[PDB]
mmCIF file of all heavy atoms in Angstrom:
data_model
loop_
_atom_site.group_PDB
_atom_site.id
_atom_site.type_symbol
_atom_site.label_atom_id
_atom_site.label_comp_id
_atom_site.label_asym_id
_atom_site.label_seq_id
_atom_site.Cartn_x
_atom_site.Cartn_y
_atom_site.Cartn_z
ATOM 1 N N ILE A 90 -19.955 -9.915 -3.078
ATOM 2 C CA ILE A 90 -19.708 -8.528 -2.697
ATOM 3 C C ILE A 90 -18.752 -8.443 -1.499
ATOM 4 O O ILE A 90 -18.464 -7.337 -1.069
ATOM 5 C CB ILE A 90 -20.996 -7.715 -2.427
ATOM 6 C CG1 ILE A 90 -21.820 -8.323 -1.252
ATOM 7 C CG2 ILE A 90 -21.806 -7.547 -3.742
ATOM 8 C CD1 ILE A 90 -22.856 -7.290 -0.659
ATOM 9 N N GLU A 91 -18.278 -9.576 -0.968
ATOM 10 C CA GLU A 91 -17.354 -9.593 0.173
ATOM 11 C C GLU A 91 -15.955 -10.064 -0.176
ATOM 12 O O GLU A 91 -15.006 -9.636 0.503
ATOM 13 C CB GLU A 91 -17.883 -10.464 1.318
ATOM 14 C CG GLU A 91 -19.019 -9.806 2.065
ATOM 15 C CD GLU A 91 -19.381 -10.418 3.411
ATOM 16 O OE1 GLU A 91 -18.766 -11.438 3.804
ATOM 17 O OE2 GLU A 91 -20.393 -9.957 3.987
ATOM 18 N N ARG A 92 -15.807 -10.955 -1.172
ATOM 19 C CA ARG A 92 -14.490 -11.521 -1.475
ATOM 20 C C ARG A 92 -14.074 -11.128 -2.878
ATOM 21 O O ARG A 92 -14.866 -11.300 -3.818
ATOM 22 C CB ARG A 92 -14.571 -13.060 -1.427
ATOM 23 C CG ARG A 92 -15.132 -13.629 -0.126
ATOM 24 C CD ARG A 92 -14.121 -13.608 0.997
ATOM 25 N NE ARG A 92 -14.594 -14.407 2.127
ATOM 26 C CZ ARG A 92 -13.846 -15.278 2.797
ATOM 27 N NH1 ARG A 92 -12.573 -15.466 2.464
ATOM 28 N NH2 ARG A 92 -14.364 -15.971 3.801
ATOM 29 N N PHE A 93 -12.814 -10.633 -3.018
ATOM 30 C CA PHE A 93 -12.305 -10.091 -4.292
ATOM 31 C C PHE A 93 -10.898 -10.608 -4.583
ATOM 32 O O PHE A 93 -9.931 -9.883 -4.402
ATOM 33 C CB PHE A 93 -12.319 -8.551 -4.214
ATOM 34 C CG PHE A 93 -13.699 -7.988 -3.996
ATOM 35 C CD1 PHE A 93 -14.228 -7.868 -2.714
ATOM 36 C CD2 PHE A 93 -14.496 -7.627 -5.070
ATOM 37 C CE1 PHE A 93 -15.491 -7.313 -2.513
ATOM 38 C CE2 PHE A 93 -15.771 -7.093 -4.870
ATOM 39 C CZ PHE A 93 -16.268 -6.960 -3.595
ATOM 40 N N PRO A 94 -10.773 -11.887 -4.982
ATOM 41 C CA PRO A 94 -9.436 -12.495 -5.066
ATOM 42 C C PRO A 94 -8.693 -12.322 -6.380
ATOM 43 O O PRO A 94 -7.517 -12.717 -6.425
ATOM 44 C CB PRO A 94 -9.710 -13.993 -4.868
ATOM 45 C CG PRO A 94 -11.155 -14.122 -4.442
ATOM 46 C CD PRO A 94 -11.820 -12.926 -5.090
ATOM 47 N N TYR A 95 -9.337 -11.815 -7.454
ATOM 48 C CA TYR A 95 -8.748 -11.873 -8.793
ATOM 49 C C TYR A 95 -8.380 -10.497 -9.310
ATOM 50 O O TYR A 95 -9.226 -9.781 -9.851
ATOM 51 C CB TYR A 95 -9.723 -12.616 -9.738
ATOM 52 C CG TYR A 95 -10.074 -13.993 -9.226
ATOM 53 C CD1 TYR A 95 -11.260 -14.216 -8.545
ATOM 54 C CD2 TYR A 95 -9.156 -15.034 -9.295
ATOM 55 C CE1 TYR A 95 -11.570 -15.471 -8.014
ATOM 56 C CE2 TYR A 95 -9.448 -16.292 -8.759
ATOM 57 C CZ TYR A 95 -10.670 -16.511 -8.149
ATOM 58 O OH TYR A 95 -11.008 -17.759 -7.653
ATOM 59 N N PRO A 96 -7.096 -10.125 -9.209
ATOM 60 C CA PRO A 96 -6.701 -8.774 -9.630
ATOM 61 C C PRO A 96 -6.387 -8.626 -11.107
ATOM 62 O O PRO A 96 -5.917 -9.556 -11.758
ATOM 63 C CB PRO A 96 -5.426 -8.500 -8.808
ATOM 64 C CG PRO A 96 -4.820 -9.857 -8.599
ATOM 65 C CD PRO A 96 -5.963 -10.871 -8.599
ATOM 66 N N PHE A 97 -6.587 -7.418 -11.604
ATOM 67 C CA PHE A 97 -6.153 -7.030 -12.949
ATOM 68 C C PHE A 97 -5.621 -5.604 -12.905
ATOM 69 O O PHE A 97 -5.828 -4.880 -11.922
ATOM 70 C CB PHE A 97 -7.223 -7.242 -14.032
ATOM 71 C CG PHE A 97 -8.501 -6.438 -13.941
ATOM 72 C CD1 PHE A 97 -8.716 -5.353 -14.781
ATOM 73 C CD2 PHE A 97 -9.538 -6.831 -13.086
ATOM 74 C CE1 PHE A 97 -9.927 -4.647 -14.751
ATOM 75 C CE2 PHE A 97 -10.759 -6.153 -13.083
ATOM 76 C CZ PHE A 97 -10.957 -5.074 -13.929
ATOM 77 N N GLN A 98 -4.890 -5.223 -13.952
ATOM 78 C CA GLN A 98 -4.324 -3.893 -13.993
ATOM 79 C C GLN A 98 -4.722 -3.175 -15.242
ATOM 80 O O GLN A 98 -4.814 -3.771 -16.330
ATOM 81 C CB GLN A 98 -2.781 -3.949 -13.899
ATOM 82 C CG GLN A 98 -2.122 -4.891 -14.945
ATOM 83 C CD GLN A 98 -0.627 -5.031 -14.813
ATOM 84 O OE1 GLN A 98 0.111 -4.044 -14.727
ATOM 85 N NE2 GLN A 98 -0.168 -6.278 -14.794
ATOM 86 N N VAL A 99 -4.976 -1.885 -15.085
ATOM 87 C CA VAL A 99 -5.299 -0.984 -16.204
ATOM 88 C C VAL A 99 -4.166 0.026 -16.170
ATOM 89 O O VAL A 99 -4.038 0.761 -15.194
ATOM 90 C CB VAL A 99 -6.691 -0.294 -16.045
ATOM 91 C CG1 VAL A 99 -6.983 0.694 -17.190
ATOM 92 C CG2 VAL A 99 -7.828 -1.320 -15.914
ATOM 93 N N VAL A 100 -3.301 0.018 -17.204
ATOM 94 C CA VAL A 100 -2.144 0.905 -17.249
ATOM 95 C C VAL A 100 -2.468 2.117 -18.156
ATOM 96 O O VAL A 100 -3.068 1.942 -19.222
ATOM 97 C CB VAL A 100 -0.900 0.138 -17.729
ATOM 98 C CG1 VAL A 100 0.359 1.003 -17.599
ATOM 99 C CG2 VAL A 100 -0.736 -1.214 -17.002
ATOM 100 N N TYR A 101 -2.158 3.347 -17.696
ATOM 101 C CA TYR A 101 -2.415 4.550 -18.493
ATOM 102 C C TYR A 101 -1.331 5.556 -18.206
ATOM 103 O O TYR A 101 -0.356 5.214 -17.548
ATOM 104 C CB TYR A 101 -3.824 5.121 -18.250
ATOM 105 C CG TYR A 101 -4.064 5.809 -16.918
ATOM 106 C CD1 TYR A 101 -4.578 7.104 -16.864
ATOM 107 C CD2 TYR A 101 -3.907 5.125 -15.719
ATOM 108 C CE1 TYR A 101 -4.865 7.721 -15.646
ATOM 109 C CE2 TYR A 101 -4.161 5.744 -14.492
ATOM 110 C CZ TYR A 101 -4.658 7.036 -14.460
ATOM 111 O OH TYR A 101 -4.920 7.650 -13.252
ATOM 112 N N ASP A 102 -1.520 6.794 -18.694
ATOM 113 C CA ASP A 102 -0.652 7.957 -18.561
ATOM 114 C C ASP A 102 0.032 8.041 -17.192
ATOM 115 O O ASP A 102 1.252 8.168 -17.135
ATOM 116 C CB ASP A 102 -1.495 9.232 -18.801
ATOM 117 C CG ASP A 102 -0.777 10.412 -19.426
ATOM 118 O OD1 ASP A 102 0.400 10.247 -19.844
ATOM 119 O OD2 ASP A 102 -1.404 11.489 -19.541
ATOM 120 N N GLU A 103 -0.751 7.910 -16.101
ATOM 121 C CA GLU A 103 -0.287 8.074 -14.722
ATOM 122 C C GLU A 103 0.219 6.789 -14.017
ATOM 123 O O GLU A 103 0.613 6.862 -12.847
ATOM 124 C CB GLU A 103 -1.383 8.770 -13.896
ATOM 125 C CG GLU A 103 -1.561 10.224 -14.319
ATOM 126 C CD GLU A 103 -2.667 11.011 -13.648
ATOM 127 O OE1 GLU A 103 -2.495 11.397 -12.469
ATOM 128 O OE2 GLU A 103 -3.668 11.324 -14.333
ATOM 129 N N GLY A 104 0.280 5.664 -14.737
ATOM 130 C CA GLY A 104 0.793 4.403 -14.201
ATOM 131 C C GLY A 104 -0.267 3.315 -14.063
ATOM 132 O O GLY A 104 -1.335 3.422 -14.675
ATOM 133 N N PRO A 105 -0.031 2.255 -13.258
ATOM 134 C CA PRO A 105 -1.063 1.199 -13.159
ATOM 135 C C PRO A 105 -2.155 1.437 -12.126
ATOM 136 O O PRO A 105 -1.885 1.952 -11.029
ATOM 137 C CB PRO A 105 -0.254 -0.041 -12.818
ATOM 138 C CG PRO A 105 0.957 0.495 -12.047
ATOM 139 C CD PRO A 105 1.183 1.918 -12.479
ATOM 140 N N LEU A 106 -3.399 1.016 -12.466
ATOM 141 C CA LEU A 106 -4.549 1.024 -11.564
ATOM 142 C C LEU A 106 -4.854 -0.426 -11.298
ATOM 143 O O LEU A 106 -5.016 -1.194 -12.251
ATOM 144 C CB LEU A 106 -5.740 1.696 -12.187
ATOM 145 C CG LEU A 106 -5.507 3.148 -12.482
ATOM 146 C CD1 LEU A 106 -6.705 3.712 -13.126
ATOM 147 C CD2 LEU A 106 -5.135 3.946 -11.234
ATOM 148 N N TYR A 107 -4.943 -0.816 -10.016
ATOM 149 C CA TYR A 107 -5.184 -2.218 -9.640
ATOM 150 C C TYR A 107 -6.590 -2.420 -9.142
ATOM 151 O O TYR A 107 -7.039 -1.738 -8.233
ATOM 152 C CB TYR A 107 -4.182 -2.669 -8.575
ATOM 153 C CG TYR A 107 -2.750 -2.626 -9.070
ATOM 154 C CD1 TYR A 107 -1.823 -1.752 -8.506
ATOM 155 C CD2 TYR A 107 -2.331 -3.436 -10.121
ATOM 156 C CE1 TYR A 107 -0.499 -1.715 -8.949
ATOM 157 C CE2 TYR A 107 -1.016 -3.394 -10.589
ATOM 158 C CZ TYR A 107 -0.097 -2.558 -9.975
ATOM 159 O OH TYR A 107 1.215 -2.511 -10.413
ATOM 160 N N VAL A 108 -7.291 -3.362 -9.794
ATOM 161 C CA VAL A 108 -8.713 -3.620 -9.558
ATOM 162 C C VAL A 108 -8.888 -5.101 -9.216
ATOM 163 O O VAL A 108 -8.295 -5.947 -9.886
ATOM 164 C CB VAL A 108 -9.480 -3.258 -10.875
ATOM 165 C CG1 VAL A 108 -10.983 -3.432 -10.693
ATOM 166 C CG2 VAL A 108 -9.181 -1.804 -11.336
ATOM 167 N N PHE A 109 -9.709 -5.420 -8.183
ATOM 168 C CA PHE A 109 -9.876 -6.798 -7.745
ATOM 169 C C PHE A 109 -11.305 -7.274 -7.956
ATOM 170 O O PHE A 109 -12.269 -6.640 -7.489
ATOM 171 C CB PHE A 109 -9.516 -6.937 -6.260
ATOM 172 C CG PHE A 109 -8.051 -6.700 -5.980
ATOM 173 C CD1 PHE A 109 -7.520 -5.401 -6.003
ATOM 174 C CD2 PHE A 109 -7.217 -7.759 -5.641
ATOM 175 C CE1 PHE A 109 -6.148 -5.189 -5.781
ATOM 176 C CE2 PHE A 109 -5.850 -7.543 -5.394
ATOM 177 C CZ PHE A 109 -5.334 -6.268 -5.467
ATOM 178 N N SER A 110 -11.427 -8.368 -8.720
ATOM 179 C CA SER A 110 -12.721 -8.942 -9.061
ATOM 180 C C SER A 110 -13.111 -10.072 -8.108
ATOM 181 O O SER A 110 -12.259 -10.834 -7.671
ATOM 182 C CB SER A 110 -12.664 -9.488 -10.486
ATOM 183 O OG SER A 110 -13.838 -10.223 -10.823
ATOM 184 N N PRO A 111 -14.423 -10.245 -7.842
ATOM 185 C CA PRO A 111 -14.843 -11.380 -7.017
ATOM 186 C C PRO A 111 -14.737 -12.744 -7.705
ATOM 187 O O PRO A 111 -14.737 -13.755 -7.007
ATOM 188 C CB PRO A 111 -16.307 -11.042 -6.687
ATOM 189 C CG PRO A 111 -16.791 -10.258 -7.922
ATOM 190 C CD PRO A 111 -15.578 -9.406 -8.279
ATOM 191 N N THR A 112 -14.694 -12.786 -9.060
ATOM 192 C CA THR A 112 -14.645 -14.068 -9.754
ATOM 193 C C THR A 112 -13.688 -14.001 -10.932
ATOM 194 O O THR A 112 -13.446 -12.923 -11.494
ATOM 195 C CB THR A 112 -16.030 -14.479 -10.281
ATOM 196 O OG1 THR A 112 -16.449 -13.585 -11.312
ATOM 197 C CG2 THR A 112 -17.091 -14.541 -9.192
ATOM 198 N N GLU A 113 -13.199 -15.179 -11.360
ATOM 199 C CA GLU A 113 -12.344 -15.229 -12.555
ATOM 200 C C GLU A 113 -13.154 -14.875 -13.781
ATOM 201 O O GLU A 113 -12.628 -14.193 -14.666
ATOM 202 C CB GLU A 113 -11.795 -16.649 -12.754
ATOM 203 C CG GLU A 113 -10.622 -16.960 -11.866
ATOM 204 C CD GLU A 113 -10.129 -18.380 -12.051
ATOM 205 O OE1 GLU A 113 -9.378 -18.621 -13.022
ATOM 206 O OE2 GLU A 113 -10.549 -19.264 -11.270
ATOM 207 N N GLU A 114 -14.430 -15.352 -13.862
ATOM 208 C CA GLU A 114 -15.235 -15.081 -15.057
ATOM 209 C C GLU A 114 -15.447 -13.555 -15.241
ATOM 210 O O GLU A 114 -15.385 -13.037 -16.366
ATOM 211 C CB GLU A 114 -16.582 -15.836 -14.982
ATOM 212 C CG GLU A 114 -17.415 -15.757 -16.251
ATOM 213 C CD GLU A 114 -18.369 -14.582 -16.372
ATOM 214 O OE1 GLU A 114 -18.587 -13.862 -15.369
ATOM 215 O OE2 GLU A 114 -18.910 -14.388 -17.486
ATOM 216 N N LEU A 115 -15.729 -12.840 -14.122
ATOM 217 C CA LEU A 115 -15.965 -11.418 -14.261
ATOM 218 C C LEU A 115 -14.709 -10.683 -14.642
ATOM 219 O O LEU A 115 -14.774 -9.742 -15.428
ATOM 220 C CB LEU A 115 -16.567 -10.893 -12.950
ATOM 221 C CG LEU A 115 -17.163 -9.496 -12.959
ATOM 222 C CD1 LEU A 115 -18.222 -9.318 -14.071
ATOM 223 C CD2 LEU A 115 -17.800 -9.204 -11.609
ATOM 224 N N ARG A 116 -13.544 -11.094 -14.094
ATOM 225 C CA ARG A 116 -12.273 -10.481 -14.484
ATOM 226 C C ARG A 116 -12.036 -10.679 -15.987
ATOM 227 O O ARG A 116 -11.651 -9.734 -16.674
ATOM 228 C CB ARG A 116 -11.100 -11.077 -13.687
ATOM 229 C CG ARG A 116 -9.731 -10.530 -14.143
ATOM 230 C CD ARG A 116 -8.584 -10.983 -13.257
ATOM 231 N NE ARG A 116 -8.366 -12.434 -13.322
ATOM 232 C CZ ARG A 116 -7.375 -13.055 -12.696
ATOM 233 N NH1 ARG A 116 -6.535 -12.375 -11.930
ATOM 234 N NH2 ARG A 116 -7.215 -14.363 -12.831
ATOM 235 N N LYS A 117 -12.318 -11.906 -16.479
ATOM 236 C CA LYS A 117 -12.107 -12.230 -17.879
ATOM 237 C C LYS A 117 -13.016 -11.353 -18.754
ATOM 238 O O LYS A 117 -12.560 -10.811 -19.779
ATOM 239 C CB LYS A 117 -12.410 -13.715 -18.110
ATOM 240 C CG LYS A 117 -12.186 -14.146 -19.537
ATOM 241 C CD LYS A 117 -12.515 -15.617 -19.701
ATOM 242 C CE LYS A 117 -11.267 -16.466 -19.677
ATOM 243 N NZ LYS A 117 -11.545 -17.858 -20.128
ATOM 244 N N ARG A 118 -14.298 -11.187 -18.349
ATOM 245 C CA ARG A 118 -15.228 -10.347 -19.117
ATOM 246 C C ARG A 118 -14.708 -8.899 -19.231
ATOM 247 O O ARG A 118 -14.737 -8.295 -20.305
ATOM 248 C CB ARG A 118 -16.622 -10.310 -18.462
ATOM 249 C CG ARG A 118 -17.487 -11.512 -18.781
ATOM 250 C CD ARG A 118 -18.947 -11.236 -18.469
ATOM 251 N NE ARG A 118 -19.379 -11.634 -17.148
ATOM 252 C CZ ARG A 118 -20.506 -11.219 -16.575
ATOM 253 N NH1 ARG A 118 -21.297 -10.340 -17.197
ATOM 254 N NH2 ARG A 118 -20.844 -11.661 -15.374
ATOM 255 N N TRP A 119 -14.184 -8.361 -18.114
ATOM 256 C CA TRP A 119 -13.667 -6.979 -18.117
ATOM 257 C C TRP A 119 -12.373 -6.853 -18.923
ATOM 258 O O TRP A 119 -12.206 -5.873 -19.658
ATOM 259 C CB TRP A 119 -13.431 -6.518 -16.667
ATOM 260 C CG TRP A 119 -14.682 -5.968 -16.060
ATOM 261 C CD1 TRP A 119 -15.758 -6.671 -15.570
ATOM 262 C CD2 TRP A 119 -15.043 -4.578 -15.992
ATOM 263 N NE1 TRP A 119 -16.754 -5.800 -15.172
ATOM 264 C CE2 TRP A 119 -16.332 -4.504 -15.407
ATOM 265 C CE3 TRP A 119 -14.387 -3.387 -16.350
ATOM 266 C CZ2 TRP A 119 -16.954 -3.285 -15.143
ATOM 267 C CZ3 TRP A 119 -15.014 -2.180 -16.103
ATOM 268 C CH2 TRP A 119 -16.299 -2.138 -15.529
ATOM 269 N N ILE A 120 -11.470 -7.839 -18.818
ATOM 270 C CA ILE A 120 -10.219 -7.736 -19.583
ATOM 271 C C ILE A 120 -10.548 -7.812 -21.089
ATOM 272 O O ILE A 120 -10.041 -7.007 -21.881
ATOM 273 C CB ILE A 120 -9.181 -8.783 -19.159
ATOM 274 C CG1 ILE A 120 -8.683 -8.481 -17.712
ATOM 275 C CG2 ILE A 120 -7.981 -8.845 -20.158
ATOM 276 C CD1 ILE A 120 -7.821 -9.584 -17.153
ATOM 277 N N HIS A 121 -11.407 -8.775 -21.477
ATOM 278 C CA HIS A 121 -11.804 -8.855 -22.901
ATOM 279 C C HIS A 121 -12.434 -7.587 -23.407
ATOM 280 O O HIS A 121 -12.091 -7.144 -24.504
ATOM 281 C CB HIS A 121 -12.747 -10.039 -23.126
ATOM 282 C CG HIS A 121 -12.119 -11.387 -23.004
ATOM 283 N ND1 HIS A 121 -12.896 -12.531 -23.076
ATOM 284 C CD2 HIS A 121 -10.842 -11.749 -22.744
ATOM 285 C CE1 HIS A 121 -12.071 -13.544 -22.897
ATOM 286 N NE2 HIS A 121 -10.826 -13.142 -22.714
ATOM 287 N N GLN A 122 -13.417 -7.034 -22.675
ATOM 288 C CA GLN A 122 -14.032 -5.801 -23.137
ATOM 289 C C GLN A 122 -13.103 -4.619 -23.138
ATOM 290 O O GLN A 122 -13.164 -3.832 -24.076
ATOM 291 C CB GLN A 122 -15.285 -5.451 -22.363
ATOM 292 C CG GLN A 122 -16.531 -6.221 -22.802
ATOM 293 C CD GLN A 122 -17.005 -5.921 -24.237
ATOM 294 O OE1 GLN A 122 -16.627 -4.923 -24.877
ATOM 295 N NE2 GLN A 122 -17.959 -6.689 -24.676
ATOM 296 N N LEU A 123 -12.266 -4.455 -22.096
ATOM 297 C CA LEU A 123 -11.288 -3.367 -22.113
ATOM 298 C C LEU A 123 -10.345 -3.533 -23.327
ATOM 299 O O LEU A 123 -10.085 -2.561 -24.026
ATOM 300 C CB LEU A 123 -10.499 -3.327 -20.802
ATOM 301 C CG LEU A 123 -11.258 -2.631 -19.658
ATOM 302 C CD1 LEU A 123 -10.673 -3.043 -18.319
ATOM 303 C CD2 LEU A 123 -11.178 -1.122 -19.806
ATOM 304 N N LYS A 124 -9.859 -4.752 -23.599
ATOM 305 C CA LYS A 124 -8.972 -4.952 -24.760
ATOM 306 C C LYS A 124 -9.691 -4.568 -26.060
ATOM 307 O O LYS A 124 -9.029 -4.039 -26.981
ATOM 308 C CB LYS A 124 -8.495 -6.393 -24.830
ATOM 309 C CG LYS A 124 -7.413 -6.668 -23.791
ATOM 310 C CD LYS A 124 -7.030 -8.141 -23.809
ATOM 311 C CE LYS A 124 -5.780 -8.371 -22.981
ATOM 312 N NZ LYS A 124 -4.650 -7.540 -23.466
ATOM 313 N N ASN A 125 -11.019 -4.818 -26.149
ATOM 314 C CA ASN A 125 -11.784 -4.447 -27.332
ATOM 315 C C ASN A 125 -11.843 -2.908 -27.482
ATOM 316 O O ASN A 125 -11.597 -2.388 -28.578
ATOM 317 C CB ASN A 125 -13.214 -4.996 -27.218
ATOM 318 C CG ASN A 125 -14.044 -4.691 -28.453
ATOM 319 O OD1 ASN A 125 -13.644 -4.999 -29.571
ATOM 320 N ND2 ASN A 125 -15.161 -3.994 -28.293
ATOM 321 N N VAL A 126 -12.208 -2.162 -26.401
ATOM 322 C CA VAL A 126 -12.382 -0.712 -26.531
ATOM 323 C C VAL A 126 -11.039 0.028 -26.762
ATOM 324 O O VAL A 126 -11.056 1.124 -27.351
ATOM 325 C CB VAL A 126 -13.236 -0.094 -25.382
ATOM 326 C CG1 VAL A 126 -14.605 -0.760 -25.295
ATOM 327 C CG2 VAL A 126 -12.512 -0.178 -24.046
ATOM 328 N N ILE A 127 -9.909 -0.542 -26.335
ATOM 329 C CA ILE A 127 -8.599 0.081 -26.516
ATOM 330 C C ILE A 127 -7.886 -0.363 -27.796
ATOM 331 O O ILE A 127 -6.783 0.107 -28.039
ATOM 332 C CB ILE A 127 -7.678 -0.134 -25.279
ATOM 333 C CG1 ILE A 127 -7.149 -1.604 -25.201
ATOM 334 C CG2 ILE A 127 -8.393 0.326 -23.987
ATOM 335 C CD1 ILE A 127 -6.168 -1.877 -24.056
ATOM 336 N N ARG A 128 -8.451 -1.347 -28.536
ATOM 337 C CA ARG A 128 -7.826 -2.004 -29.700
ATOM 338 C C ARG A 128 -7.144 -1.048 -30.686
ATOM 339 O O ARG A 128 -6.069 -1.385 -31.197
ATOM 340 C CB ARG A 128 -8.880 -2.871 -30.430
ATOM 341 C CG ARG A 128 -8.330 -3.736 -31.568
ATOM 342 C CD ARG A 128 -9.451 -4.470 -32.296
ATOM 343 N NE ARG A 128 -8.915 -5.227 -33.427
ATOM 344 C CZ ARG A 128 -9.524 -6.250 -34.017
ATOM 345 N NH1 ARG A 128 -10.719 -6.655 -33.597
ATOM 346 N NH2 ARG A 128 -8.942 -6.879 -35.029
ATOM 347 N N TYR A 129 -7.743 0.137 -30.914
ATOM 348 C CA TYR A 129 -7.214 1.092 -31.905
ATOM 349 C C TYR A 129 -6.455 2.262 -31.296
ATOM 350 O O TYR A 129 -6.135 3.221 -31.995
ATOM 351 C CB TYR A 129 -8.314 1.552 -32.852
ATOM 352 C CG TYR A 129 -8.972 0.402 -33.600
ATOM 353 C CD1 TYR A 129 -10.244 -0.045 -33.252
ATOM 354 C CD2 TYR A 129 -8.302 -0.271 -34.622
ATOM 355 C CE1 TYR A 129 -10.831 -1.144 -33.891
ATOM 356 C CE2 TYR A 129 -8.883 -1.368 -35.275
ATOM 357 C CZ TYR A 129 -10.151 -1.796 -34.908
ATOM 358 O OH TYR A 129 -10.740 -2.868 -35.543
ATOM 359 N N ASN A 130 -6.084 2.148 -30.007
ATOM 360 C CA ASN A 130 -5.279 3.173 -29.343
ATOM 361 C C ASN A 130 -3.886 3.265 -29.967
ATOM 362 O O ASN A 130 -3.374 2.281 -30.493
ATOM 363 C CB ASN A 130 -5.152 2.878 -27.839
ATOM 364 C CG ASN A 130 -6.400 3.209 -27.098
ATOM 365 O OD1 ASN A 130 -7.423 3.568 -27.690
ATOM 366 N ND2 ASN A 130 -6.347 3.112 -25.765
ATOM 367 N N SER A 131 -3.295 4.451 -29.915
ATOM 368 C CA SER A 131 -1.987 4.713 -30.508
ATOM 369 C C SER A 131 -0.781 4.406 -29.607
ATOM 370 O O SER A 131 0.339 4.310 -30.116
ATOM 371 C CB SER A 131 -1.920 6.160 -30.986
ATOM 372 O OG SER A 131 -2.254 7.053 -29.937
ATOM 373 N N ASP A 132 -0.983 4.269 -28.288
ATOM 374 C CA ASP A 132 0.159 4.053 -27.395
ATOM 375 C C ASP A 132 0.129 2.698 -26.658
ATOM 376 O O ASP A 132 0.662 2.593 -25.545
ATOM 377 C CB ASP A 132 0.299 5.240 -26.409
ATOM 378 C CG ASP A 132 0.203 6.619 -27.043
ATOM 379 O OD1 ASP A 132 1.025 6.921 -27.938
ATOM 380 O OD2 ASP A 132 -0.672 7.411 -26.617
ATOM 381 N N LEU A 133 -0.455 1.656 -27.295
ATOM 382 C CA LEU A 133 -0.490 0.315 -26.704
ATOM 383 C C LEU A 133 0.924 -0.212 -26.561
ATOM 384 O O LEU A 133 1.724 -0.126 -27.504
ATOM 385 C CB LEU A 133 -1.348 -0.672 -27.525
ATOM 386 C CG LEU A 133 -2.825 -0.318 -27.694
ATOM 387 C CD1 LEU A 133 -3.501 -1.316 -28.580
ATOM 388 C CD2 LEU A 133 -3.564 -0.253 -26.346
ATOM 389 N N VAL A 134 1.259 -0.706 -25.374
ATOM 390 C CA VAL A 134 2.602 -1.215 -25.112
ATOM 391 C C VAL A 134 2.704 -2.703 -25.426
ATOM 392 O O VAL A 134 1.677 -3.390 -25.483
ATOM 393 C CB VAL A 134 3.122 -0.840 -23.704
ATOM 394 C CG1 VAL A 134 3.371 0.667 -23.620
ATOM 395 C CG2 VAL A 134 2.169 -1.304 -22.592
#
Side-chain angles (χ1 to χ4, degrees):
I90 61 162
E91 286 195 358
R92 306 283 192 135
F93 299 85
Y95 304 99
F97 64 104
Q98 53 184 310
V99 177
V100 188
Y101 73 127
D102 211 8
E103 291 176 75
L106 297 178
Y107 298 115
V108 183
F109 293 75
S110 172
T112 67
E113 280 178 81
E114 187 271 349
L115 192 54
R116 176 173 65 176
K117 181 181 261 192
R118 279 197 267 164
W119 275 77
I120 292 171
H121 290 175
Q122 280 295 343
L123 279 160
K124 284 176 169 303
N125 182 53
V126 303
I127 74 177
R128 187 184 177 160
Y129 302 105
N130 284 6
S131 54
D132 313 301
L133 299 176
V134 291

